[PDB]
Amino acid sequence: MVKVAILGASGGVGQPLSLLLKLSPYVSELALYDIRAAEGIGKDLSHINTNSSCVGYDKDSIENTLSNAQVVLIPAGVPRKPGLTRDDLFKMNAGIVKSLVTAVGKFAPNARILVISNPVNSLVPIAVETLKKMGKFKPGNVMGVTNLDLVRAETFLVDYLMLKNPKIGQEQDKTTMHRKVTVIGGHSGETIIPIITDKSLVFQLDKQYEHFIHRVQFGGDEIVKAKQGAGSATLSMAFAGAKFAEEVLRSFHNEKPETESLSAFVYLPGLKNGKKAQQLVGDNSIEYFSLPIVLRNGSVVSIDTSVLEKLSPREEQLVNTAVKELRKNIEKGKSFILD
Amino acid sequence: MVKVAILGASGGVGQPLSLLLKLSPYVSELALYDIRAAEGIGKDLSHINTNSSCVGYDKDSIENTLSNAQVVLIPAGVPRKPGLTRDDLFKMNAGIVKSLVTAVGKFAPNARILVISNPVNSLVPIAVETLKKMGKFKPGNVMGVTNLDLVRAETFLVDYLMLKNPKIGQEQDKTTMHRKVTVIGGHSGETIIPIITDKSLVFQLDKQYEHFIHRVQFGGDEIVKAKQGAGSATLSMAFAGAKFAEEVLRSFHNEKPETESLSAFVYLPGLKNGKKAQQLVGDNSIEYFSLPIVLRNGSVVSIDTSVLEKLSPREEQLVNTAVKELRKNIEKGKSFILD
């Protein structure tokens, strides 16, 4: 019997994520937590005719939320908004994550912890260092959820191909494009590295290729702009987070994944092929990257570095630009907590 | 293959309904409309890697939202604040539906209109009478979405069986309970008529049967109380809405519906076997009732009255009590248009 806990279940991402999870046939118990309104939402979702019992909990009941939880989804965090800077946004979400991840350490230390809160590049290290300090860190069980970059890469590959010549475009299926594209690096801007694995499609995009790459990298900013500062991508974040959790849940049930080269943002030095990945990205000491993972029983047991062993010269340049900015993001998270 | 428009896509039901609708493989084009925020929500959802083209529209562009739409979902309506009066909450939504159904008469008269706003018992007649004044009413194409009653009956039948007879409870699958229960009638309180079609489960339910009946009837109010007046069942309303929509869209192709005895709140005098239904519910002038329907190409081509012909004595009593109070609802909606 698998129990999923959602911490931040009442926010803009949290609510549609809770709905998508209630629909999963791999979940048998769904516990919803937040500082307000989760009981109500959980009661609303308990009426859906799927086989999972769903309960929400009040601000004071994070212990009941997390008890016997195998998977913990953390979408909690303050959204992008006009009068908020990225640094204050970061510092507030840093406090939310540390507090929530500390609760996981006390109440469900063996849970697979899926961090959805942004910025992923800086907040995952806050979660790891928090678990290290308590003596509760298992590298295979802490994943920064970067799956929305893949989603967008799948969507835009088709959109740019539909633009360049509808012939190959109208042949694509957006639902199956992960066989053709993989995304690695971090989860913001130029840290994001879209790798089209199907090299015929690169050629066919021709000069649309750099437009594609830029569009995947800046997809977050596009939605903020389209909601005039007053929101970011909530429904698609919920969707990507549910898709990624479904892959983790499939693995509990000894099924194979659906996504080819499914990536998450993980702690390299604690996993198999991690040091190999550090070399391949050109920084023997970089602690995190989003790379293709192999899951056993919900947990990352190795990193598949295949993608890094066949980079184009242009991709190698995306990597080296990404690694430079990513290092600063990692260092920013880790010093905020360690100092 | 088909364009779907959603009117009221930024509201509490509408945003989650729009996400679920983005996931449907039966949709070619998904158009979102609201007084505000639909552009942004549409742009968010356009990043999801499913094949539909998703565009949102501003308050002045309802015409481009509806152009060539074949199915139109109307979740629009006002969110109950903890103050709001029974009566005046109808009045506000009555005006919203009249306005939006008139836009449909003008800009997509052939479209299947799925009314999701509440109260459905009064809002569909409003919808129908509005379209009658314009001379655009096609009776196969106006449907009050009552599916959440079937969803809850499916859910609560399993929950009640589990609470008192775990052995048989645990052999139930909530996703497939529609083979074993049908809900008919109206869409509010004692107008809701749950008909357990599988007679063995009436026995298995034993002394819980009345509690089941009552839970289906008063499901909504359960959620309002759990939100302390500050909202309602938005997430399950969206689920049941996408689920009905998907049966509608399925109808355009060579596929049996998934749900057995799928019901919608429809205009009896305009549909094959409607007068029989009128006869069998024992009011030969009642104009509306939720009954199992047959969809061909998105439209009700006839009503299926079988469930009416095998009613138990208790279920006849529900039908009579539900008919009295449902006549009242229907008239309160006709009199907002006809006076």
Same domain, A190 and A213: yes
Element (H, E) at B73: strand B71-74
Say if residues A139 and A270 touch (Cβ distance below 8 Å): yes
| Best mutation target, B10, B13, B44, B52, to test chain A (most A CBs within 10 A) | B44
Same domain, B139 and B225: no
Dist. CA A48–CA B21, nearest whole Å:
17
CA B49 to chain centre: 28
DSSP summary character for residue B194? E
Same domain, B164 and B51: no
DSSP summary character for residue B339? -
Nearest to B231 among A40, A50, A173 (CB): A40
Number of Cβ within 10 Å of residue A35's Cβ equals 14
CA A55 to chain centre: 24
Helices then strands, each counted (H, E), chain B: 13, 11
Strand partners, B6: B32, B73
Resolution (A): 2.1
Element (H, E) at B4: strand B2-7
Dist. CA B46–CA B156, nearest whole Å:
35
Q: Which CATH number covers residue B220? A: 3.90.110.10
Q: Beta strand pairing status for A263-267 and A192-196?
A: unpaired
Dist. CA B277–CA A19, nearest whole Å:
36
Dist. CA A2–CA A52, nearest whole Å:
9
Same domain, A110 and A10: yes
Q: Taking phi first (over 0 means left), then psi (-120 to 50 degrees means alpha), and beta for anything else, what does residue A185 get? A: left
Strand partners, B2: B27
Calculate how close chain B gets to A245, using CA atoms only, in Å.
16
Dist. CA B295–CA B279, nearest whole Å:
22
Pick the residue from chain B with its C-alpha nearest to A154. Answer: B49
Q: Answer whether A233 sits within 8 Å of B44, measured CB to CB.
A: yes
Phi, psi for residue A336 in degrees, rounded to 5 = -55, -45
Dist. CA A200–CA B282, nearest whole Å:
68
Phi, psi for residue B141 in degrees, rounded to 5 = -110, 10
Dist. CA A294–CA A272, nearest whole Å:
10
Q: B247: closest CA among B261, B236, B234, B262?
A: B262
Q: Beta strand pairing status for A288-296 and A263-267?
A: antiparallel
Q: Answer whether B16 sits within 8 Å of A16, measured CB to CB.
A: yes
User: How distant, in Å, are the alpha carbons of A10, A303, B330 from that of A106?
Assistant: 23, 28, 56
Q: Which residues of B189-203 are buried (b: 16+ CB within 10 A; e: fewer)?
A: ebbbbbbbbeeebee
Dist. CA A50–CA B151, nearest whole Å:
9
**Locate tokens 């469900």: which residue?**
A108
Q: Which domain holds residue B7?
A: 1-145
Q: Answer whether B236 sits within 8 Å of A44, measured CB to CB.
A: yes
Dist. CA B40–CA B35, nearest whole Å:
12
Strand partners, B290: B185, B265
Cβ contacts of A233 on chain B, cutoff 8 Å:
44, 47
Angle at B105 between CA B103 and CA B109, to 5 degrees: 125
Say if residues B211 and B196 touch (Cβ distance below 8 Å): no
Say if residues A278 and A267 touch (Cβ distance below 8 Å): no
Three-state DSSP state, B61: coil
Number of Cβ within 10 Å of residue B315's Cβ equals 18
Last residue in a domain, options B83, B114, B145: B145
- The answer to whether the Cα torsion of A5, A8, A10, A11 is positive or negative is negative
Strand partners, B29: B3, B53
Number of Cβ within 10 Å of residue A335's Cβ equals 11
Q: B263: closest CA among B297, B300, B314?
A: B300
End-to-end CA distance of chain B: 41
Q: B236: closest CA among B253, B223, B254?
A: B223
Cβ contacts of B170 on chain A, cutoff 8 Å:
none
Dist. CA A186–CA A148, nearest whole Å:
12
**Inter-chain CB pairs, A–B, below 8 Å:** 117
Q: Beta strand pairing status for A181-185 and A3-7?
A: unpaired
**Locate tokens 């979740």: which residue?**
B75
Compute and round to an integer the Cα radius of gyration of chain A: 19
Q: Answer whether B40 sits within 8 Å of A238, measured CB to CB.
A: no
Strand partners, B32: B6, B56
Q: Beta strand pairing status for B192-195 and B182-185?
A: antiparallel
Same domain, B301 and B319: yes
Dist. CA B150–CA B247, nearest whole Å:
14
Dist. CA B6–CA B100, nearest whole Å:
11
Q: A90-96 contacts: CB < 8 A, separation 24 or more?
A: A90/A119, A90/A122, A90/A332, A90/A336, A91/A336, A93/A117, A93/A118, A93/A119, A93/A123, A94/A122, A94/A123, A94/A126, A94/A333, A94/A336, A94/A337, A96/A8
Q: Which residues of B205-227 are buried (b: 16+ CB within 10 A; e: fewer)?
A: beebbeebbebbbebbeebbebb
Calculate how close chain B gets to A79, using CA atoms only, in Å.
14
Say if residues A186 and A329 touch (Cβ distance below 8 Å): yes
Same domain, A251 and A130: no
Cβ contacts of A46 on chain B, cutoff 8 Å:
155
Which residue type is seen at A244?
A: F
Q: Answer whether B235 sits within 8 Å of A174, measured CB to CB.
A: no
Cβ contacts of A39 on chain B, cutoff 8 Å:
226
Calculate how close chain A gets to B256, using CA atoms only, in Å.
20
Phi, psi for residue B83 in degrees, rounded to 5 = -85, -35
3-state helix, strand, coil in chain B (%, to 5): 55, 15, 30
Dist. CA A278–CA A276, nearest whole Å:
5
Q: Which two tokens stand for residue B270?
A: 């305009």
User: How distant, in Å, are the alpha carbons of A16, A45, A58, A60, A313 from that of A64?
Assistant: 22, 18, 10, 9, 51
Calculate how close chain B gets to A226, using CA atoms only, in Å.
5
Nearest to A219 among B23, B47, B234 (CB): B47
**Three-class SS of chain A:** CCEEEEECCCCCCHHHHHHHHHCCCCCCEEEEECCCCHHHHHHHHCCCCCCCEEEEECCCCHHHHHCCCCEEEECCCCCCCCCCCHHHHHHHHHHHHHHHHHHHHHHCCCCEEEECCCCHHHHHHHHHHHHHHHCCCCHHHEEECCHHHHHHHHHHHHHHHHHHCHHHHCCCCHHHHHHCEEEEECCCHHHEEEEECCHHHHHHHHHHHHHHHHHHHCHHHHHHHHCCCCCCCHHHHHHHHHHHHHHHHHHHCCCCCCCCCCEEEEEHHHCECHHHHHHHHCCCCCCEEEEEEEEECCEEEEECCHHHHHCCHHHHHHHHHHHHHHHHHHHHHHHHHHC
Same domain, B134 and B157: no
| Best mutation target, A28, A47, A228, to test chain B (most B CBs within 10 A) | A47
Same domain, B130 and B194: no
Elucidation method: X-ray
Compute and round to an integer the Cα radius of gyration of chain B: 19
Last residue in a domain, options A129, A145, A161: A145
Element (H, E) at B104: helix B86-107
Say if residues B123 and B8 touch (Cβ distance below 8 Å): no
Q: How many domains does chain A have?
A: 2
CA atoms within 13 A on the CB side of B300: 33
Last residue in a domain, options A145, A161, A193: A145
Cβ contacts of A16 on chain B, cutoff 8 Å:
15-16, 19
Element (H, E) at B30: strand B27-33
Same domain, B254 and B160: yes
Phi, psi for residue A12 in degrees, rounded to 5 = -70, -45
Q: Which residues of B115-145 are buried (b: 16+ CB within 10 A; e: fewer)?
A: bbbbbbbbbbbbbbbbbeeeebbbbbbbbbb
Catalytic residues of B: 187
Q: Which CATH number covers residue B115? A: 3.40.50.720
Angle at B286 between CA B285 and CA B291, to 5 degrees: 135
Say if residues A71 and A242 touch (Cβ distance below 8 Å): no
Q: In B191-305, at which residue ranges do the beta strands (DSSP E only) sit?
A: 192-195, 263-267, 288-296, 299-303
Same domain, A134 and A152: no
**Locate tokens 């919808």: which residue?**
B127
Same domain, B175 and B135: no
Same domain, B156 and B195: yes
CA atoms within 13 A on the CB side of A272: 9
Q: Which two tokens stand for residue B153?
A: 């009956």
How long is chain A?
339
